[PDB]
Amino acid sequence: VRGELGVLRVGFTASSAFNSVVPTAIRAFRRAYPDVRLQLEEDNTTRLADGLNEGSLDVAFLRPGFAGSERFHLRMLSEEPMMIVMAENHPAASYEEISLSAFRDETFLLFPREIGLTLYDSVIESCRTAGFEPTIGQLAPQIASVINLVAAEMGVSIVPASMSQVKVIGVVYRHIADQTPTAKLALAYRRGDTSPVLRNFVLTVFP
Amino acid sequence: ELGVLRVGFTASSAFNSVVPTAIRAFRRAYPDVRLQLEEDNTTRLADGLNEGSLDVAFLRPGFAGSERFHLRMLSEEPMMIVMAENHPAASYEEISLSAFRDETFLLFPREIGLTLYDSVIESCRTAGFEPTIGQLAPQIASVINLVAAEMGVSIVPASMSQVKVIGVVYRHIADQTPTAKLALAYRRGDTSPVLRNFVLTVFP
C-alpha cells in the first residue's frame, strides 16, 4: 500500500502533450491510484530538467539529447517520424512523397530555439542534410500556433508525427523521403528516488 | 498597395478559418504588403491598436474601451464540449450542461481568453451550478490533452474540434449557450489605403 497516497508532479513538453503516450501514461495512473494527487506542469525540456533537479518535479516526459542527460534515469519512451506541414493549395502536396530539397527556397516557420531546443537543431540538420540552410520565418508561440500560421499559407513547418492530429482546414502533413529525423521522447526521473509513488507511476508506463 | 500592415489575432481565432482565409487571400492579392502577425489575447490586441503597434486585429467584441475603435462582426461559432472518449457523457446524442455539475472543468484563461472564459463560467451558472475549476496552477495552453488524460472536461469554440487528439470527443450543447464571437478591429479614422484593402478583403 506504500505510495498509493500523496502527491506527484508530472512535467511534459508542449508538443509531447500531443503524443498519445503522455495522456495515456497519466490516464492509466489516475486509474490505479485515484488517491494520489497529480500536478501537471508543461514546460521546456531544460525547464523540466532543472525542475527535476530542484525537487519541483518528480517525473518528466522529455526529449533526450540534452546536456547533462547523464544525471537522471532516462527511459526511452517513443520515437516518431518528422513530417512537413504545408498548405493544401501548395504546389508540393501534389508530389506523392516529398523530398525536402523541394523546400529550399521556402520560408520555414519554427518555434524559438529556447522554446524548443532539441526539436530545432534536428529540424535544421534535415534541411542541412537536404543541402540548404533553412530560411527562418516568423517566431510563433507554441507548436499548434505554427499550424494555423501554415493554414494562412505563411510557411511550411516540420512537426512531430503526432501533430498530424491537429486537422485544421487548409494544411496537410506529408512525409519526408530523406533521413526523416525522428522526435524522441523519454521518461526521465531522479536517480536514487526511493519514492514508492514515483515507481507506482514509473511501472504504470512500464508494466 | 505598398508598405507593411500589422495584423493581430487571438490564439483561439486562428482555428476559425476566417483568419487564415482572409490572410492567405490578402497575401495573394497584395504581395507587396509585408504582413506582420502578432498572436496575442484581445486585451493586448487593443493595446497594440492604441499604442500603434497593430493596425488591424481579429478579436472578441464587447471588451471595455471598444468604443475607441471600429469593430465589424466577423463570425459566431457555437461552443461545444470536449471530453475524454470513455466519459459517461460520450454516449448521449445531445448533452446538457446540467449533467456536468459535479464535474471538473478545465478552463485556462490563457488558451481561450477572458471574454470566452467568463462566458463559459456564466453559462454553467445559468445551468444551475458554479463550475468546479480544475487546475488553477501553472496554466498550460491546450486542455484537450489533459482531457484525453481523463482529468476533466472543457468547453471550446466549435473551431477547436479540428484538434482530433486521440481519446477525446466533442459534443454540441443542448442548453442555449452564448457563442464564441469574433470581430475585426482597426482604429477609428485610420486613413490608410493599405488598411482598407485588408478590411475589404475580409468583408467583400
Numbering used by the authors:
A (entry chain C): 86 to 292
B (entry chain D): 89 to 292
Recite the paper's sentences.
The bacterial protein ItcR is unique in its ability to bind to itaconate. Structurally, ItcR is a transcriptional regulator protein with an N-terminal DNA-binding helix-turn-helix motif and a C-terminal itaconate-binding domain (IBD)24. Multiangle light scattering (MALS) analysis showed that IBD appears as homodimer in solution. Here, we report the development of a highly responsive, genetically encoded itaconate fluorescent biosensor, referred to as BioITA (biosensor for itaconate).
Furthermore, the crystal structure of IBD without or with itaconate binding was determined by multiple-wavelength anomalous diffraction and refined at a resolution of 3.25 and 1.48 Å, respectively. In line with the result of MALS, the IBD proteins form a homodimer in both of the apo and itaconate bound states. Notably, alignment between the structures of IBD in the apo and itaconate bound states demonstrated that monomer in each dimer exhibited translocation of over 7 and 10 Å in the N- and C-termini, respectively.
